[PDB]
Design goal:
Chain lengths: 49, 140, 153, 174, 98, 48
C-alpha cells in the first residue's frame, strides 16, 4: 500500500495541482453568485412544469 | 456512511453516461450550432423570426397516444394542472407521418432496437401501437 | 497501538466498502473523459454565446409581459421524412469544418449561419431550389397520394 | 534505510496532523453534502428522468437543428371529425444554398460530380433531371452502415452502395 | 517483559493496519492508470470551463431550455396555451427571402 | 474546499429542486419532441 500510494502520487501530483487550480478558477464565479444559482434552481421547476 | 455512498452514486452516474456516450456526443455537437442558430434568428432584438409553412394538412397530427379530445381545457382558465406521463405518437411505426418520433429513438443499451423510453428499450415485450390515426374520431 | 487498531479497523471498513466502486467508476470514466476532452474547444464559445443571447431571448418573450413577440411570414415547407431512410440516428460527431468548435458570433454583418449537416439521417441540404412538393396532393381515406416520396428533391 | 524512514515518518506524521486539523472539518462537510445531493438526484424518479432525458434529447436537438431555415431565418411552423380528409403541399422553397453548406465531418463531403441528399451520407447525382430519384449511380459515404432504405432508392443506389448500407465492407468511390 | 505484556495489542494493531492497507493497495493499484488518464483528458474541459465560468451562471438561464428563457415563462404561458403576438409581414423583403 | 463547501451547501439546500427538475423534465421531453418530428418544421395549433 505504501508503494502503491507513492507511485500514484508520483504520477498524479502535477495533474492534481492543475486540477485544483482549474477547480478554483471554476468555483470562484459560482461562489461570487451563489444566490443567483439558488434562485434559478428554485424557479426552474415551475417553468419546466 | 457518506464516502461509500458518494462513490457508489458517482459510479452510477459515470456508468449511465458511458451507456449514453453517443447521445452526449450528439448533444455536445448540437449545442454550439443551436447557439449559432439563436444568434442568426435574434438579429432583431425585440422580435424573433417565426415563419408559417404553406399547405394545410400535408402532414396530419397524430392524436393517438395523447390526451383525449374531450379532456382539452378551455383557454379562459389559467390554472396549471399536473402534466400526465407516457404520451407520444403511437402510430404503427411505419408510413411517412412522424418518422422521427419517440417510437424510433435508437436504444443505446439494446443494439438494433427503437423505443420511446429506456424503460421500453429494456423491456422485451414487443411494441404494440395504440392504433392507426383516423380522421373521423375514435382515435383511442 | 490502540489508536492504530481503531484507525485501521475504521479505514479498512471504509476502503472495503468504497474501493471497488471507485475502481469501476475510474474504469468507466475513460470514454466520457475522452469525449469531454475531444469536444472541449466548443465549450467556452458555446457558454459565451448563450450568455450573450440570453438577454435578447429574454426580452423577446418578456418585453410585453403578457405575450411573445414573433415575426410571421409565410413560406413553403419541405417533404416529410420517408420511413426507412430518414430514421433517427445518434451517430453525430465533430463540428464546423470537421472539428468541434463554434462559428464566429452571428451579427447582422454575417447573418446566414452555415448549415451543419451531421450523421443523423435527416438534413435539408439539397433544398437549393423552388420545386413543387413530392406529396403535392394526399388523400387520407385510402392512403393514396400524388407523387413519389423521395430523399433527393 | 532506517534513519531516513524514521525522519520521513516523523515529517509526514506532522504534515498529516496539520492537514487534518486544517482541512478535515470542511472535507467531511463536502463529502456529506455531495452524498446527500447525489442521493436526492438518484432516487428512482430522478433516475428515470435522467434516463429519459439522455435518451430523448439528442434527437430533439437534431430535429430542431433541421427545423431552422438559413435563408429565411428563424423557425418554420406550419399550422394544423379529427381533421380534413384531404391535404395539400404546393411547393418547397429553397431553405439553404450551395454556398451555405458546411459538413460536420470530412467524410460527408460529396466528391465532384455528386450532390447531397436529405439523408446525410447518401450522395445522389447532379443533373437537370436528377430530382425525384431519376439518376442511377448514387454512392454512400464510408461508415454509413445501419440505415434501412425503401425499394425505390435501393433500385437506384447501385449494388455496392446498397450492400454497404447493410453489410460490412465499405465501397471504393470512383 | 512489557512487550510480552502487550503482544496481543501489537498483533491486533499490525493486523488492523494490514486490513486497511490491503484494501488501500487494491484500490490504488486498480485506479492508478485509469485515474491518470481521466485527469489528463479532463484537464482541457476544466480549463475551458474556467474560461467560461463567469458566463455560466447567466447561460444557465438558457443553456438548458435553448428557445425558452426561464425568467418570463410564468407570464408568457398561462397554462395550456403559449401566448404569442403575430406580426404578419408582407413586405417585399420578406416575400423575396421566403 | 471552503468554496466547494458553500457551493455544495447551496446545492444541498436545493437538492429537492434538482430532483424535481429531473422528474418533471424527464416526463415531457419525448412528448415535446414529438411535435417536431413529422418534417423539417414543427406543428402549431393557432387557436385564434
Amino acid at each position: 500500500a505504501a508503494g502503491s500510494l507513492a507511485d500514484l502520487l508520483s504520477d498524479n501530483r502535477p495533474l492534481l495541482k492543475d486540477t485544483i487550480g482549474y477547480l478554483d478558477v471554476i468555483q470562484a464565479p459560482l461562489v461570487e453568485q451563489k444566490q443567483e444559482v439558488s434562485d434559478i434552481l428554485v424557479q426552474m421547476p415551475q417553468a419546466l412544469k | 456512511e457518506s464516502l461509500p455512498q458518494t462513490l457508489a452514486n458517482l459510479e452510477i452516474v459515470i456508468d449511465m453516461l458511458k451507456r449514453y456516450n453517443k447521445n452526449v456526443e450528439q448533444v455536445l455537437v448540437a449545442l454550439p450550432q443551436g447557439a449559432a442558430v439563436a444568434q442568426t434568428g435574434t438579429i432583431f432584438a425585440p422580435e424573433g423570426l417565426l415563419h408559417f409553412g404553406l399547405g394545410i394538412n400535408a402532414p396530419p397530427p397524430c392524436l393517438t397516444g395523447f390526451l383525449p379530445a374531450s379532456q382539452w381545457r378551455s383557454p379562459a382558465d389559467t390554472r396549471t394542472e399536473p402534466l400526465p406521463s407516457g404520451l407520444y405518437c403511437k402510430i404503427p411505426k411505419d408510413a411517412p407521418n412522424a418518422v422521427r418520433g419517440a417510437r424510433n429513438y435508437p436504444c443505446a443499451d439494446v443494439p438494433g432496437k427503437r423505443a420511446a423510453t429506456p424503460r421500453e428499450c429494456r423491456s422485451d415485450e414487443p411494441y404494440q401501437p395504440l392504433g392507426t390515426n383516423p380522421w373521423y374520431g375514435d382515435p383511442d | 497501538l490502540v489508536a492504530a487498531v481503531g484507525f485501521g479497523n475504521t479505514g479498512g471498513d471504509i476502503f472495503e466498502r468504497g474501493g471497488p466502486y471507485l475502481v469501476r467508476g475510474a474504469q468507466d470514466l475513460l470514454p466520457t473523459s475522452a469525449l469531454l476532452d475531444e469536444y472541449s474547444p466548443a465549450l467556452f464559445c458555446t457558454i459565451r454565446n448563450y450568455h450573450d443571447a440570453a438577454p435578447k431571448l429574454a426580452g423577446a418573450l418578456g418585453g410585453n409581459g403578457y405575450s411573445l413577440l414573433t415575426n410571421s411570414l409565410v413560406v413553403g415547407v419541405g417533404n416529410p421524412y420517408v420511413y426507412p431512410d430518414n430514421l433517427p440516428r445518434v451517430n453525430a460527431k465533430g463540428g464546423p469544418e470537421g472539428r468541434p468548435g463554434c462559428w464566429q458570433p452571428i451579427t447582422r454583418d454575417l447573418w446566414p449561419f452555415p448549415y451543419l449537416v451531421m450523421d443523423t439521417g435527416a438534413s435539408i441540404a439539397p433544398y437549393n431550389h423552388f420545386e413543387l412538393g413530392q406529396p403535392m396532393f394526399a388523400e387520407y381515406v385510402w392512403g393514396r397520394q400524388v407523387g413519389e416520396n423521395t430523399i433527393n428533391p | 534505510e532506517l534513519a531516513n524512514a524514521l525522519q520521513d515518518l516523523n515529517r509526514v506524521l506532522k504534515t498529516t496532523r496539520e492537514f487534518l486539523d486544517r482541512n478535515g472539518g470542511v472535507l467531511t462537510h463536502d463529502i456529506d453534502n455531495l452524498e446527500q445531493v447525489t442521493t436526492a438526484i438518484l432516487q428512482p424518479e430522478p433516475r428515470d428522468g435522467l434516463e429519459t432525458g439522455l435518451h430523448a434529447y439528442p434527437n430533439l436537438a437534431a430535429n430542431v437543428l433541421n427545423i431552422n431555415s438559413p435563408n429565411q431565418g428563424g423557425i418554420i411552423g406550419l399550422p394544423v371529425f379529427n381533421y380534413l380528409p384531404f391535404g395539400m403541399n404546393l411547393a418547397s422553397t429553397a431553405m439553404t444554398l450551395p454556398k451555405q453548406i458546411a459538413y460536420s465531418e470530412k467524410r460527408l463531403q460529396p466528391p465532384p460530380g455528386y450532390k447531397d441528399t436529405t439523408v446525410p451520407g447518401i450522395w445522389s447525382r447532379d443533373t437537370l433531371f436528377s430530382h425525384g430519384n431519376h439518376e442511377p449511380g448514387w454512392i454512400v459515404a464510408p461508415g454509413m452502415q445501419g440505415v434501412q432504405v425503401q425499394p425505390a432508392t435501393a433500385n437506384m443506389l447501385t449494388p455496392e452502395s446498397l450492400a454497404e448500407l447493410l453489410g460490412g465492407p465499405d465501397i471504393v468511390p470512383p | 517483559q512489557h512487550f510480552a505484556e502487550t503482544r496481543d495489542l501489537f498483533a491486533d494493531a499490525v493486523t488492523a493496519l494490514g486490513r486497511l492497507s490491503a484494501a488501500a493497495d487494491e484500490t490504488l493499484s486498480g485506479s492508478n492508470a485509469n485515474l491518470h488518464t481521466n485527469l489528463q483528458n479532463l484537464q482541457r474541459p476544466l480549463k475551458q470551463l474556467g474560461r467560461a465560468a463567469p458566463y455560466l451562471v447567466g447561460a444557465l438561464k438558457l443553456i438548458l431550455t435553448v428557445p425558452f428563457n426561464i425568467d418570463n415563462i410564468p407570464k408568457a404561458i398561462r397554462g395550456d396555451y403559449i401566448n404569442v403576438s403575430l406580426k404578419l409581414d408582407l413586405t417585399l423583403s420578406s416575400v423575396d427571402n421566403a | 474546499l471552503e468554496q466547494l463547501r458553500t457551493v455544495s451547501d447551496v446545492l444541498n439546500e436545493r437538492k429537492q429542486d434538482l430532483a424535481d427538475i429531473l422528474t418533471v423534465a424527464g416526463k415531457f421531453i419525448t412528448s415535446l419532441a414529438e411535435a417536431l418530428a413529422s418534417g423539417p418544421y414543427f406543428k402549431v395549433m393557432l387557436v385564434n
